[PDB]
């Protein structure tokens, strides 16, 4: 039987419960309108799956170890991806060749060939088992491998000029949910600007050229100390864009931070370095290498975003949930009505028809 | 007191509101079955935390600068991860040595040693302060650094053979939520296939070997132009899997796009190039290097996914939300019934027991 | 008119339906406290958008090709990022020069110059078009390019010592929504610890030093085979932290996996290798190179996390959803009461005030 049910309903008309209920309903409606609808923008579809493309190029020349270093010297790796290192300090061990020689760390002091056993395996090469004089004052165990051993201990200068190097970032982003593409280079960017522009969060925040020194500052770091220990900075690019607004309002927000934080909270491992070697060999077959311990700033360009564009389906479901939520005030209004007019017995009786068996 | 409450209810039996309510219920149920259940597949749990692995290897040989280039010559970096560059064009500066020489861009034209001060510090090397004859017609400032300076400007040919190179991808994906692992190399991949296979959207869509020219075509690019300016292409690998279906129906979908989008939309920064150097030294200790300004196509293999497998809890909560939603027709049924039969007063009186105090 | 509506309600008092409904309500409340509140911890805000930075440094020395290899030889690339390779096996093709020579894979068998045409376009250098003796028994096609050609096929040893190398990880993580930073190096780590500590999932899970052999074991991989074939293992670092709990309880979880899973289930692509060359050139201008086909284990240090901390708004809306959901038992209690008490007619009559017209 095609029959429509609906509840029998009391309809109190107290001025008190009337105004207090209407106020609770106003609060529910205004909360839903201002927060869930305007602020949390539930009337639109969101895309968080952003597609990004980063190309980098470092520029500047510097003095180090009586050489002029350009980008090809101090940038590692070279292909201009979203992570690169600018080397600020180098510990060179020139012309290592495969052979025999003693370690240089005091960690390996010896007087007898018997002390040189399978105890201290890492580092350099493999122990020959002998104990040999490294200097007039010290004897250490002898090893086979790249000779001479590097000294990890005496401090070298840092490349101050690196502070005035420039990082050019070229970022392309695409929101597929809205098939919307844009990049951090606006069409009114000129060659002349590129030649002279200066990124600053306030003074010029759209300039693709970033002074290393500026970035180090924005992250609150002392170039002098960071360049000595090495470390990692993040240049974050955020694209939070409401596509319901104007196309030219989808704009890049740059942020600057140091990522290897644990390092400062550590006296044991204070920075970021790595070791690699330049490989040569003579007209004789013999090979030799230049070993560099490289200290520098790693830069991660970090691109995130999320975009919203209005759609009818989310709006519809949000308004339906809104209407279904206007009802929830009834329980509080029940409590007020049934316990705050002295004649509560009247209302409990009016509303509740007891039964028993 | 162990008491069960339930409201007093009108139970109208008008044929009109009866059938209109039953039809509204049929529509709510059919939306929930067709949309929320079949389409949006709400009966299963979804996992997007996919685990992926990309291993790459390039093949091909070409003529450039009267040499045969193999992969080790044109692929950078070499380790065959999900991002790599295939170099298509090169502007070379042979045998740079550390020294003194004049700059070569007209950007540094001078007549006086006084123009060459500490003002235009980046690029090439460091100004020595003199102004030097660069050619019989031109004077530019002298610098200390890698000499001679690179000439940026004469356009060089591209490596046409690069079009016919092959990119081999090896992708492993794993869904931890369902402990389901699979890769883009289907168990029916044979050696003979590998020897001749052919990625093609139609003819061989599971061939792990992709022609560069193909991929460039697929991104809607002209190899000539891309090989001239450089760029970044994305090879996307999708694992959209309905695990309720067959294990052998979990299949990879290849899709092709150019990620450095801003570049064609820009007159200032039109492609992708980078600079790196081959470091040598004479039998004498003397160092010399080959400076390469490298133009090429960047490929990043992009693996995303989501799989769903049925679970009981999503079905339970969706059916619970269904029943809690079946009522929602009542507000519309109320307005129609309670305001469109002229004798609406009957229903108001039967339903509404007014009160006053 | 500020008027409050509310439904009229039956109020059964049967002991039976009283306890059965009260039990259903107890079960809903206990589930909501135990599941949605204790387990799924809905009283707190979650952030998964963790920012992470990894720096690695590999250590150990080993014998390969009758040389001692240190980190600068076998780790690639060298900058100490979240992905690196420890090379375990090498197939070297020494002193290659650009020239003419026949191929060395049997894939290029020939007897006549007519077989070597533009027919088999890929691979090696360019076919010179002639057919030349490769061996006393076999003839292959001649190519222009780096000579002699590499033979991929003769089996070489592995660097057994690689098993005993050590990977040092330094991970910095940041939950930005709660602006909480920490690292995997706890402040009570000493130099002495670093010198001798030993990572173990149970005994010392905070030692940042992981023996490669251990990592290979933990991923359920056999060093000998992984080192022969090459492969990819994942080192995942998880930060599951309840900030409501103790601060020194935000702790990293190590997990070990092989990511290139497709490799073992496949007869086509069994490991991980790549090729690169050491570049030299004579005192004559002419270049010659050492070609290495490099086999090793790739390492991805994989950092995920999510933190939850109590907030009032999630607690409020969960308690609200709890109370609004407690009602749902009424439908089942209706069916039970109105059809399983013999006096169902009493309640049908009490509750339902029919209408007809
Ligand atoms: N770090 C940087 N500092 C200043 N300008 C830069 C930097 N990187 C790139 N540019 C400039 O931005 C413009 C576009 O960069 P791009 O490298 O794509 O062009 P290019 O002609 O290859 O550059 P270049 O010839 O200067 O190496 C160029 O004019 C270049 O001079
Ligand atoms: N793979 C490893 N195995 C054991 N200890 C290591 C390893 N890597 C680093 N350490 C220890 O932790 C310390 C911090 O390393 P970091 O690279 O930050 O600086 P470093 O002193 O130049 O390293 P090293 O002296 O090993 O070259 C190191 O000095 C070293 O003693
Ligand atoms: N870019 C490519 N084009 C064509 N074939 C490829 C390519 N990459 C790999 N292959 C083939 O796929 C197989 C899997 O590659 P894998 O590197 O695992 O083996 P491999 O022995 O090192 O290959 P090869 O030595 O022949 O390059 C190889 O036998 C190789 O022939
Ligand atoms: O998911 C958490 C929630 O946080 C933010 O909301 C804040 C709000 O910004 C503040 O004004 C504060 O007073 O109230 C909220 C605390 O929960 C975001 O605005 C919101 O989008 C985000 O979801
Ligand atoms: O592109 C025009 C655009 O108009 C509408 O945009 C509105 C939007 O609804 C509001 O949120 C506001 O912030 O911006 C506009 C009104 O000033 C719609 O987004 C859409 O129909 C259309 O694309
Ligand atoms: O809630 C957003 C919604 O977006 C998409 O829904 C599509 C639907 O799939 C199309 O068939 C179209 O006709 O209607 C909607 C308009 O976007 C997603 O399919 C879905 O996952 C998501 O719920
Ligand atoms: O193939 C065995 C498989 O059977 C079941 O899968 C069903 C699935 O649940 C249904 O949605 C239906 O549409 O397709 C499948 C039948 O092919 C279960 O998943 C399980 O028993 C098992 O995995
Ligand atoms: O169902 C997805 C679910 O997985 C986990 O929940 C578990 C729960 O932890 C166990 O106690 C079990 O008995 O019930 C569920 C079945 O897996 C996750 O904890 C949870 O986040 C997720 O929703
Ligand atoms: O200690 C400050 C911290 O207190 C709160 O954490 C509580 C938590 O809610 C309780 O469940 C209890 O078990 O642990 C803590 C009490 O010591 C909040 O997390 C937060 O307001 C505050 O930071
Ligand atoms: C940066 O350049 C300015 C002007 O060329 C100079 O005064 C300053 O010393 C430079 N910074 C460093 C760290 O050398
Ligand atoms: C280019 O136009 C945009 C659009 O509003 C504007 O923000 C910007 O200032 C313009 N470019 C420059 C260099 O001022
Ligand atoms: C190779 O010749 C050089 C001299 O140019 C010499 O230093 C080196 O010791 C020779 N190699 C061997 C193994 O003797
Ligand atoms: C690419 O290969 C096709 C056939 O495989 C050939 O016709 C074409 O000439 C090749 N392109 C180049 C630049 O060699
Ligand atoms: C391999 O299997 C896929 C589906 O799993 C099928 O489409 C394809 O035809 C198969 N290839 C061969 C050579 O049978
Ligand atoms: C690795 O070290 C262990 C114990 O220190 C030793 O037993 C084993 O022989 C070593 N293996 C190699 C290849 O050096
Ligand atoms: C350092 O503290 C952590 C946690 O507070 C603890 O697990 C570890 O045992 C401590 N270190 C030592 C050397 O005991
Ligand atoms: C360069 O010199 C080497 C020997 O030093 C010789 O083998 C080679 O053929 C020469 N080539 C040219 C082009 O001079
Ligand atoms: Ca040391
Ligand atoms: Ca230029
Ligand atoms: Ca081969």
Numbering used by the authors:
A (entry chain C), B (entry chain A), C (entry chain B): 7 to 363
From the paper:
P2X3 receptors are a family of trimeric cation channels that are activated by extracellular ATP. They play particularly important roles in sensory neurons where their activation is critical for gustatory and nociceptive responses, visceral reflexes and sensory hypersensitization. P2X3 homomeric receptors activate and desensitize on the millisecond timescale upon binding ATP but unbind ATP and recover from desensitization on the timescale of minutes. Although free-ATP is an agonist in laboratory conditions, P2X3 receptors are activated primarily by Ca2+-ATP and Mg2+-ATP under physiological conditions because ATP released from cells at micromolar concentrations would largely be in complex with Ca2+ and Mg2+, both of which are present in millimolar concentrations in extracellular physiological solutions.
We began by crystalizing the hP2X3 MFCslow construct in solutions containing ATP with either Mg2+ or Ca2+. We solved X-ray structures of the receptor with Mg2+-ATP or Ca2+-ATP bound at resolutions of 3.8 Å and 3.3 Å, respectively. The pores appear to be in an open-like conformation in both structures, similar to that observed in the structure of hP2X3 bound to free-ATP. Importantly, we observed strong residual electron densities around the ATP binding site in these structures. Considering that the crystallization conditions included either 50 mM Mg-acetate or 50 mM Ca-acetate with no other divalent cations, and that the electron densities are surrounded by acidic residues, we interpreted the densities as Mg2+ and Ca2+ ions, respectively. In both structures, the divalent ions are detected at the edge of the ATP binding pocket, simultaneously interacting with D158 on the receptor and with the γ-phosphate of ATP; E156 is also positioned nearby and appears to be involved in coordinating the ion. A survey of the Protein Data Bank (PDB) reveals that the geometry of the Mg2+-ATP and Ca2+-ATP complexes observed in our structures is highly unusual. By contrast, the presence of 1 mM Mg2+ slowed deactivation by ~8-fold, while 1 mM Ca2+ slowed deactivation by ~ 4 fold, suggesting that both ions slow ATP dissociation. Although both Mg2+ and Ca2+ ions slow hP2X3 slow deactivation, the effect of Ca2+ is more modest when compared to Mg2+, suggesting that Ca2+ might compete with Mg2+ to hasten unbinding under physiological conditions. Interestingly, the influence of Ca2+ on stabilizing ATP on the receptor and slowing recovery from desensitization is less pronounced than for Mg2+, which could explain why Ca2+ can facilitate activation of P2X3 receptors in physiological solutions containing Mg2+ in response to repeated applications of ATP.
